[PDB]
Amino acid sequence: SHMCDAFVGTWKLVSSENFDDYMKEVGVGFATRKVAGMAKPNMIISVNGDVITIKSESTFKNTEISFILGQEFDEVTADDRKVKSTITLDGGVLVHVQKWDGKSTTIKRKREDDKLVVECVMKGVTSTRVYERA
Ligand SMILES: C[C@@](CCOc1ccc(Cl)c(F)c1)(C(=O)O)c1ccc(Cl)c(Cl)c1
């Protein structure tokens, strides 16, 4: 109880850096990169007992995942990858690992001041996305 309190709420994207290069590293094709890169998603995070839900709404795609920390689940990503995901809490940071096709990417979500900072890493390439409260 109270594990992710500081994440819960409704958040809006305010900045993005290096996302196109991250998507390239992931394997995302041209047209999806262009439309996905334009998106300005809202992220809605909620907790009910042990179940965390992260919803993302944008003009590109609406997605929703619900999960228990440490417990793998199957996810279809906005770019239509079919991945095996595991999300854990490590020192206050939500760490989301996605596995598919012998590949892996990690998404870390952290509270920093009034922001929620999202770092997406694929091999040597990092993208940083900053969300503020809606
Ligand atoms: C980056 C992220 C979360 C992960 O999401 C990914 C990741 C890869 C790919 Cl290829 C993709 F399309 C989405 C965010 O927290 O900002 C996001 C959310 C929602 C949207 Cl709509 C977009 Cl574009 C990006």
UniProtKB/Swiss-Prot annotation:
Modified residues (Phosphotyrosine): 22
Sorted UniProt keywords: Acetylation, Cytoplasm, Lipid-binding, Nucleus, Phosphoprotein, Transport
Motif interval(s): Nuclear localization signal: 24-34
Molecular-function GO terms, alphabetical: fatty acid binding; hormone receptor binding; long-chain fatty acid binding; long-chain fatty acid transmembrane transporter activity
Intrachain S-S bonds: none
Biological processes per GO annotation: brown fat cell differentiation; cellular response to lithium ion; cellular response to tumor necrosis factor; cholesterol homeostasis; fatty acid transport; long-chain fatty acid transport; negative regulation of DNA-templated transcription; positive regulation of cold-induced thermogenesis
Domain of life: Eukaryota
GO CC annotations, alphabetized: cytoplasm; cytosol; extracellular exosome; lipid droplet; nucleus
Subcellular location(s) per record: Cytoplasm; Nucleus
Role description: Lipid transport protein in adipocytes. Binds both long chain fatty acids and retinoic acid. Delivers long-chain fatty acids and retinoic acid to their cognate receptors in the nucleus.
Domain notes: Forms a beta-barrel structure that accommodates hydrophobic ligands in its interior.
Stated name of the protein: Fatty acid-binding protein, adipocyte
Gene encoding the protein: FABP4
